[PDB]
Amino acid sequence: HHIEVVSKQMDPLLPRFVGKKARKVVAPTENDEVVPVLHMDDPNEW
Amino acid sequence: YIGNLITRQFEGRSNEIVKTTTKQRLDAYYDLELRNSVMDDILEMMPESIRQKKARTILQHLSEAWRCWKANIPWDVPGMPAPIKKIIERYIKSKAD
Amino acid sequence: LLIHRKGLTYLHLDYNFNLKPTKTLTTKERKKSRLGNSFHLMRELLKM
Amino acid sequence: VRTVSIHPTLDLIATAGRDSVIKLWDMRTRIPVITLVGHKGPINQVQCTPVDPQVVSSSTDATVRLWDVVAGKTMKVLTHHKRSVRATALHPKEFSVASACTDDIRSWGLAEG
Amino acid sequence: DDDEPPLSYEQHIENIEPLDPINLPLDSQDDEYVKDWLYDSRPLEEDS
Amino acid sequence: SWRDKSAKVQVKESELPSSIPAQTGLTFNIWYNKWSQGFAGNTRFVSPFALQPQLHSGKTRGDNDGQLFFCLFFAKGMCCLGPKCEYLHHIPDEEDIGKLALRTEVLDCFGREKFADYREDMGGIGSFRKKNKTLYVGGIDGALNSKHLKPAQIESRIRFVFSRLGDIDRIRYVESKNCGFVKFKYQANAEFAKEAMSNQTLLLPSDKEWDDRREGTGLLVKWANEDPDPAAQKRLQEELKLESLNMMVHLINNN
Amino acid sequence: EPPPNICEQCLGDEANIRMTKIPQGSECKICTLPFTLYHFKTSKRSNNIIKTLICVRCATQRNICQCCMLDSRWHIPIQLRDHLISLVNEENVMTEEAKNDMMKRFLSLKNVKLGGAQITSDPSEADNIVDKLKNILLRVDISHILKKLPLNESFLKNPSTKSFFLYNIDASIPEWKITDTVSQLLGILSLIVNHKAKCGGLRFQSSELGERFVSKIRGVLLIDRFRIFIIPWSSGFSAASFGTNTAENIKLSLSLNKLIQLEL
Amino acid sequence: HSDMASKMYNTDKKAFLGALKYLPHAILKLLENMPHPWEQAKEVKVLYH
Amino acid sequence: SERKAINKYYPPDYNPLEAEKLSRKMAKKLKTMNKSHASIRLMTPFSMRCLECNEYIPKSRKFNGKKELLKEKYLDSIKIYRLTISCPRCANSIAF
RNA sequence: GUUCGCGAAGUAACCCUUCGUGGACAUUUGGUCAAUUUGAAACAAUACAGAGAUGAUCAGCAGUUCCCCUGCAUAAGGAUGAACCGUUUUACAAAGAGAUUU
Ligand SMILES: [K+]
Ligand SMILES: [Mg+2]
Ligand SMILES: [Mg+2]
Ligand SMILES: [Zn+2]
Ligand SMILES: [Zn+2]
Ligand SMILES: [Zn+2]
Ligand SMILES: [Zn+2]
């Protein structure tokens, strides 16, 4: 299917983005790759 | 003006209003940044890297030192490590200045 | 319509653009109905 | 805000601080075009660089991160430091960065990480 | 009155012939070059 | 047939009810079309209007325009436009279910968009996840103006009114819970019948109560939950297996 | 920004479709977050307007069309798809959908396919599933009302009867199948069936219809080899004939069951 | 658009509230074209939603 | 509207005298117009001890209390009021 | 419909009136949206409770949060706006020594 994409002129007196709202989101922290941590090798003093 | 009002009516209010540093907030933000500065220095120099409870203990010593400075009472804690003592006195002198 | 969308039907707007409360308002009503300078500037220009 | 770095070729600055993000600003419009997310604690140093990785940043989370600013992703995460990486510097004549903890200064090749 | 809506123009106003406006009486001789047109809404707007 | 005649005008434009609802507060809100300043008194009322399928059905502009969706107000028995209506004025049938068979997954037979989750009330348009064919019929006491009636008599009334509105799988009345369950052949008839029978009375012209039928609250017609009866559950599992086996034929023949 | 995911059955068969894009024009039906709305008509003079109801990332997560939410390979609904796959896989998979709105927003942003989607989102797995599916297809007042019920009398030519009694109705049978088979026999009818009673009654419009009904083969009526038995019911019936409560209906069903087992 | 109680006016109500930011412009244009004392009835070209 | 508003809106048909007379007829049936006490905020005038649970209540503690005008008057002329608080630990009613 | 052209009848009138007929001119609106209860506005009322620090009363200013509200607002206010008060077991070892399984 060949699709002709248009974007019709919005009513300037209506809100420009009908679906737009202030809403909070918790984003998932997904990650497939594990990152190594790469360190090397009198307690009364502290 | 009216645009922002009507935008609030339809879109709602922004979730993430960042308050600026006005003179009503000046002292509190100074305290927060000073506290974080002392904590960064002490957690970096401590050999054992133990954090969770130690931080809340150390900053109480900081605040007590500040009270002693304002009272002109000599701040001296027996058994305080000498380097951490120096760090606390350093930040107390900067706040004092 | 702006008054009514905000639910402040206890405020009445005259046909000469005075805004008057229809009843003595609760403190929660006063806080909820505290319209700002944008609305009032608009209202008084319409009055003129 | 703890640091600012001026991009060597673009009309762009990078800034970071206790809010654990680097924000890139277009100088002219003052828009924060890009926010780089991934550090788990306050960022101490930011260095801008003429080629990818165009931002280098060091943090209290003990990492140095090398950024692709167009992807909004790290090229590499450097995890060899034990403490807060408080200090950093670019070498002016070779493609390298130095970074420091307590007792531990290291140097890194930016083409590879 | 505050409690009376604004009037419908077509019902109450459109049918009334207006009263005379403020026009100073111009001389047929000594104002002859302007008397025909001075009080138009756009004076000389049709004089090519 | 309904095809033999042009659709009747159910209600004249001047006879339509006012848009302002019954007062439940001190001030009418011109935005929300509802009363503010207090909330007292019930919002439910009996419908003045009821569909009469053999009398009111007929051809409309929608049949000529190739329309798919049915008229919401025809179902409510209060369509103003009659034969000039863009929407279909007849009870849904297998022809029109077939024509709706693509859109039906996400749309009502009235062309309203379905939701992810049902309302907590179980009212409204319904879920695109479930494909429910069963209506809960509550408020039966109010639908009879609190007239005492035997349970089989109530069942006979529910059997009469709902069977005008589509092909039916099952009707059961539960005396202890005082509620009925009507299951249709097609979801489109359940969608239609819900809006047709919502807020109606079950009373007859033959009843002594008929002249005050408007006073209470009408039928409360909602989507049914899943039947907890184990016989119904294993019947549901059997028809699920049968639907699956019938679908395997299509997938195999296509690939 | 990804392209819209719309199936051919939505788009139709016209060579060209005009489509209107609206950034942030709609809120997704699954996740409630804003998205770029697409809407189109199959032809210029079709009167129904089709729009994307779900966003592209919810659609790829489920492997479904944005406009009709059927599977974008197999063109079947999610429940039936996940059920089909779970007959071929021993370990069940189903599309777990969020109920809380914050979990709806959270779930939509993780880039991992859900339920039967990954098993259908590449041709190799989906073709393997259908290859295996071919193997599957290759493989207490009863003592009173029993005199109101016509059980003593028989199916006969002579008596003109407009009403009949049906029994041995299997609970699987819907009401519409019964009416439909009588309609087939009569070449075209008020029916009451109580499935907890496993019996019912049939009332015709006029006596010649009932006479034409009794003209075609106590009698029997067939529904998918369920043998509904039929008796002329001269005494008029109503819903009360089968019991006033659920327990009465069940007791009547057991009574009718033992009477059937005696008759057979 | 006198009462606007029916559901058909929802989009119109939204358009009304969005029009509110352009009122001072309309007020300027109206008062700017005010009839002067020597003219009875000024016909004016208008643009309307 | 602001705290110090000058005018309230009256409907055009509003007669104040008839309104007061109607509201007087209504007032005899409203619950909160006919309950026996008025709620007030007050400080504890002296140090006191609860008798149910022995809790000490210092002076100048703020409470939400109930005010009753009593039938009896001092020298048949001056109004006497009972002031009732409830104990902060055990919620028992204390009156003076 | 207007108009150019060609046939038939008025009017041997080739223009004007009528009829038959070829061509040109003009070319796809609108909807994210249907009209009362079942796709979701809020206050108010009623009953009961009740005011951050702590011996008591009060000015505040912050911070954390998948709570926001009023406000043109990155100002300010909303009780210091609210929520905060609870819950708390292992990176668990070494040396002995007494009852005891084996
Ligand atoms: K305070
Ligand atoms: Mg504040
Ligand atoms: Mg605060
Ligand atoms: Zn209609
Ligand atoms: Zn989505
Ligand atoms: Zn589709
Ligand atoms: Zn006590």
PDB file of N, CA and C in Angstrom, chain E:
ATOM      1  N   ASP E   1     -28.430  48.028  33.553  1.00  0.00           N
ATOM      2  CA  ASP E   1     -28.414  47.381  34.861  1.00  0.00           C
ATOM      3  C   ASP E   1     -27.504  46.157  34.847  1.00  0.00           C
ATOM      4  N   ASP E   2     -26.914  45.851  36.012  1.00  0.00           N
ATOM      5  CA  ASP E   2     -26.001  44.711  36.132  1.00  0.00           C
ATOM      6  C   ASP E   2     -26.687  43.382  35.808  1.00  0.00           C
ATOM      7  N   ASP E   3     -27.985  43.269  36.090  1.00  0.00           N
ATOM      8  CA  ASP E   3     -28.708  42.016  35.940  1.00  0.00           C
ATOM      9  C   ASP E   3     -29.443  41.879  34.606  1.00  0.00           C
ATOM     10  N   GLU E   4     -29.278  42.841  33.685  1.00  0.00           N
ATOM     11  CA  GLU E   4     -29.927  42.820  32.375  1.00  0.00           C
ATOM     12  C   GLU E   4     -28.928  42.383  31.318  1.00  0.00           C
ATOM     13  N   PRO E   5     -29.208  41.373  30.487  1.00  0.00           N
ATOM     14  CA  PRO E   5     -28.244  40.956  29.436  1.00  0.00           C
ATOM     15  C   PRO E   5     -27.995  42.060  28.414  1.00  0.00           C
ATOM     16  N   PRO E   6     -26.902  41.991  27.635  1.00  0.00           N
ATOM     17  CA  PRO E   6     -26.738  42.930  26.512  1.00  0.00           C
ATOM     18  C   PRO E   6     -27.839  42.743  25.475  1.00  0.00           C
ATOM     19  N   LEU E   7     -28.295  43.855  24.898  1.00  0.00           N
ATOM     20  CA  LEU E   7     -29.459  43.829  24.021  1.00  0.00           C
ATOM     21  C   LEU E   7     -29.174  43.078  22.726  1.00  0.00           C
ATOM     22  N   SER E   8     -30.192  42.377  22.234  1.00  0.00           N
ATOM     23  CA  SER E   8     -30.157  41.825  20.888  1.00  0.00           C
ATOM     24  C   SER E   8     -30.208  42.969  19.888  1.00  0.00           C
ATOM     25  N   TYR E   9     -29.180  43.058  19.029  1.00  0.00           N
ATOM     26  CA  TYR E   9     -29.100  44.151  18.061  1.00  0.00           C
ATOM     27  C   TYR E   9     -30.259  44.106  17.071  1.00  0.00           C
ATOM     28  N   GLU E  10     -30.577  42.915  16.549  1.00  0.00           N
ATOM     29  CA  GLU E  10     -31.565  42.818  15.478  1.00  0.00           C
ATOM     30  C   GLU E  10     -32.980  43.101  15.987  1.00  0.00           C
ATOM     31  N   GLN E  11     -33.294  42.669  17.217  1.00  0.00           N
ATOM     32  CA  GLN E  11     -34.636  42.851  17.756  1.00  0.00           C
ATOM     33  C   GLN E  11     -34.881  44.303  18.139  1.00  0.00           C
ATOM     34  N   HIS E  12     -33.941  44.897  18.874  1.00  0.00           N
ATOM     35  CA  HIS E  12     -34.176  46.156  19.562  1.00  0.00           C
ATOM     36  C   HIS E  12     -33.563  47.372  18.891  1.00  0.00           C
ATOM     37  N   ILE E  13     -32.525  47.212  18.070  1.00  0.00           N
ATOM     38  CA  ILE E  13     -31.687  48.327  17.651  1.00  0.00           C
ATOM     39  C   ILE E  13     -31.720  48.538  16.142  1.00  0.00           C
ATOM     40  N   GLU E  14     -31.732  47.446  15.352  1.00  0.00           N
ATOM     41  CA  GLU E  14     -31.599  47.523  13.890  1.00  0.00           C
ATOM     42  C   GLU E  14     -32.751  48.303  13.251  1.00  0.00           C
ATOM     43  N   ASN E  15     -33.940  48.243  13.852  1.00  0.00           N
ATOM     44  CA  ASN E  15     -35.095  48.875  13.239  1.00  0.00           C
ATOM     45  C   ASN E  15     -35.192  50.368  13.537  1.00  0.00           C
ATOM     46  N   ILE E  16     -34.393  50.902  14.464  1.00  0.00           N
ATOM     47  CA  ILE E  16     -34.523  52.299  14.871  1.00  0.00           C
ATOM     48  C   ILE E  16     -33.698  53.177  13.936  1.00  0.00           C
ATOM     49  N   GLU E  17     -34.324  54.223  13.396  1.00  0.00           N
ATOM     50  CA  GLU E  17     -33.599  55.205  12.598  1.00  0.00           C
ATOM     51  C   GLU E  17     -32.714  56.032  13.526  1.00  0.00           C
ATOM     52  N   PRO E  18     -31.419  56.189  13.230  1.00  0.00           N
ATOM     53  CA  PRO E  18     -30.549  56.971  14.120  1.00  0.00           C
ATOM     54  C   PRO E  18     -30.897  58.454  14.153  1.00  0.00           C
ATOM     55  N   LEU E  19     -30.462  59.100  15.232  1.00  0.00           N
ATOM     56  CA  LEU E  19     -30.563  60.538  15.402  1.00  0.00           C
ATOM     57  C   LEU E  19     -29.440  61.245  14.642  1.00  0.00           C
ATOM     58  N   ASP E  20     -29.567  62.570  14.536  1.00  0.00           N
ATOM     59  CA  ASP E  20     -28.596  63.377  13.808  1.00  0.00           C
ATOM     60  C   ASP E  20     -27.264  63.374  14.563  1.00  0.00           C
ATOM     61  N   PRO E  21     -26.136  63.247  13.874  1.00  0.00           N
ATOM     62  CA  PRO E  21     -24.842  63.325  14.549  1.00  0.00           C
ATOM     63  C   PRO E  21     -24.414  64.776  14.742  1.00  0.00           C
ATOM     64  N   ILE E  22     -23.228  64.947  15.323  1.00  0.00           N
ATOM     65  CA  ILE E  22     -22.629  66.270  15.455  1.00  0.00           C
ATOM     66  C   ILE E  22     -22.093  66.648  14.077  1.00  0.00           C
ATOM     67  N   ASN E  23     -22.829  67.480  13.342  1.00  0.00           N
ATOM     68  CA  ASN E  23     -22.332  68.102  12.120  1.00  0.00           C
ATOM     69  C   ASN E  23     -22.498  69.606  12.243  1.00  0.00           C
ATOM     70  N   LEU E  24     -21.402  70.338  12.090  1.00  0.00           N
ATOM     71  CA  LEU E  24     -21.471  71.792  12.064  1.00  0.00           C
ATOM     72  C   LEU E  24     -22.080  72.249  10.740  1.00  0.00           C
ATOM     73  N   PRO E  25     -23.007  73.239  10.750  1.00  0.00           N
ATOM     74  CA  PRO E  25     -23.600  73.661   9.473  1.00  0.00           C
ATOM     75  C   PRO E  25     -22.631  74.458   8.605  1.00  0.00           C
ATOM     76  N   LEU E  26     -22.258  73.841   7.491  1.00  0.00           N
ATOM     77  CA  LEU E  26     -21.315  74.424   6.552  1.00  0.00           C
ATOM     78  C   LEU E  26     -22.014  75.380   5.589  1.00  0.00           C
ATOM     79  N   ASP E  27     -21.277  76.393   5.137  1.00  0.00           N
ATOM     80  CA  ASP E  27     -21.823  77.376   4.212  1.00  0.00           C
ATOM     81  C   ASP E  27     -21.878  76.813   2.798  1.00  0.00           C
ATOM     82  N   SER E  28     -23.002  77.050   2.104  1.00  0.00           N
ATOM     83  CA  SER E  28     -23.128  76.586   0.723  1.00  0.00           C
ATOM     84  C   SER E  28     -22.151  77.296  -0.212  1.00  0.00           C
ATOM     85  N   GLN E  29     -21.753  78.527   0.117  1.00  0.00           N
ATOM     86  CA  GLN E  29     -20.776  79.265  -0.677  1.00  0.00           C
ATOM     87  C   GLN E  29     -19.357  79.142  -0.128  1.00  0.00           C
ATOM     88  N   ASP E  30     -19.163  79.520   1.139  1.00  0.00           N
ATOM     89  CA  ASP E  30     -17.836  79.676   1.728  1.00  0.00           C
ATOM     90  C   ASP E  30     -17.213  78.367   2.203  1.00  0.00           C
ATOM     91  N   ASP E  31     -17.950  77.254   2.167  1.00  0.00           N
ATOM     92  CA  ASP E  31     -17.395  75.913   2.342  1.00  0.00           C
ATOM     93  C   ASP E  31     -17.620  74.991   1.149  1.00  0.00           C
ATOM     94  N   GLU E  32     -17.911  75.548  -0.041  1.00  0.00           N
ATOM     95  CA  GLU E  32     -18.437  74.799  -1.196  1.00  0.00           C
ATOM     96  C   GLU E  32     -17.551  73.626  -1.633  1.00  0.00           C
ATOM     97  N   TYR E  33     -16.234  73.732  -1.454  1.00  0.00           N
ATOM     98  CA  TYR E  33     -15.295  72.710  -1.898  1.00  0.00           C
ATOM     99  C   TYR E  33     -15.245  71.494  -0.970  1.00  0.00           C
ATOM    100  N   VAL E  34     -15.771  71.609   0.249  1.00  0.00           N
ATOM    101  CA  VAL E  34     -15.772  70.514   1.210  1.00  0.00           C
ATOM    102  C   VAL E  34     -17.162  70.114   1.691  1.00  0.00           C
ATOM    103  N   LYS E  35     -18.201  70.942   1.474  1.00  0.00           N
ATOM    104  CA  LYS E  35     -19.547  70.708   2.017  1.00  0.00           C
ATOM    105  C   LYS E  35     -20.160  69.387   1.547  1.00  0.00           C
ATOM    106  N   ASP E  36     -19.864  68.964   0.317  1.00  0.00           N
ATOM    107  CA  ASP E  36     -20.483  67.769  -0.243  1.00  0.00           C
ATOM    108  C   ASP E  36     -19.984  66.499   0.447  1.00  0.00           C
ATOM    109  N   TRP E  37     -18.776  66.519   1.039  1.00  0.00           N
ATOM    110  CA  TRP E  37     -18.117  65.280   1.441  1.00  0.00           C
ATOM    111  C   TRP E  37     -17.450  65.240   2.811  1.00  0.00           C
ATOM    112  N   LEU E  38     -17.409  66.348   3.576  1.00  0.00           N
ATOM    113  CA  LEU E  38     -16.581  66.432   4.789  1.00  0.00           C
ATOM    114  C   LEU E  38     -16.985  65.413   5.865  1.00  0.00           C
ATOM    115  N   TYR E  39     -18.256  65.015   5.889  1.00  0.00           N
ATOM    116  CA  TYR E  39     -18.770  64.194   6.976  1.00  0.00           C
ATOM    117  C   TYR E  39     -18.993  62.740   6.589  1.00  0.00           C
ATOM    118  N   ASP E  40     -18.533  62.304   5.411  1.00  0.00           N
ATOM    119  CA  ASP E  40     -18.587  60.889   5.044  1.00  0.00           C
ATOM    120  C   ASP E  40     -17.721  60.043   5.987  1.00  0.00           C
ATOM    121  N   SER E  41     -18.003  58.728   6.030  1.00  0.00           N
ATOM    122  CA  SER E  41     -17.188  57.839   6.862  1.00  0.00           C
ATOM    123  C   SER E  41     -15.760  57.727   6.342  1.00  0.00           C
ATOM    124  N   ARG E  42     -15.591  57.651   5.022  1.00  0.00           N
ATOM    125  CA  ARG E  42     -14.286  57.746   4.376  1.00  0.00           C
ATOM    126  C   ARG E  42     -14.373  58.814   3.294  1.00  0.00           C
ATOM    127  N   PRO E  43     -14.150  60.082   3.641  1.00  0.00           N
ATOM    128  CA  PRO E  43     -14.345  61.173   2.667  1.00  0.00           C
ATOM    129  C   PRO E  43     -13.496  61.010   1.403  1.00  0.00           C
ATOM    130  N   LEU E  44     -14.136  61.213   0.236  1.00  0.00           N
ATOM    131  CA  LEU E  44     -13.567  61.100  -1.120  1.00  0.00           C
ATOM    132  C   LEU E  44     -13.121  59.688  -1.522  1.00  0.00           C
ATOM    133  N   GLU E  45     -13.545  58.637  -0.792  1.00  0.00           N
ATOM    134  CA  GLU E  45     -13.139  57.243  -1.055  1.00  0.00           C
ATOM    135  C   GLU E  45     -13.601  56.707  -2.417  1.00  0.00           C
ATOM    136  N   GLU E  46     -14.545  57.370  -3.073  1.00  0.00           N
ATOM    137  CA  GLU E  46     -14.959  56.998  -4.418  1.00  0.00           C
ATOM    138  C   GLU E  46     -14.498  57.967  -5.503  1.00  0.00           C
ATOM    139  N   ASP E  47     -13.846  59.078  -5.147  1.00  0.00           N
ATOM    140  CA  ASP E  47     -13.393  60.098  -6.109  1.00  0.00           C
ATOM    141  C   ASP E  47     -11.994  59.762  -6.632  1.00  0.00           C
ATOM    142  N   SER E  48     -11.956  59.085  -7.788  1.00  0.00           N
ATOM    143  CA  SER E  48     -10.781  58.425  -8.369  1.00  0.00           C
ATOM    144  C   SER E  48      -9.569  59.334  -8.615  1.00  0.00           C
TER     145      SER E  48
END
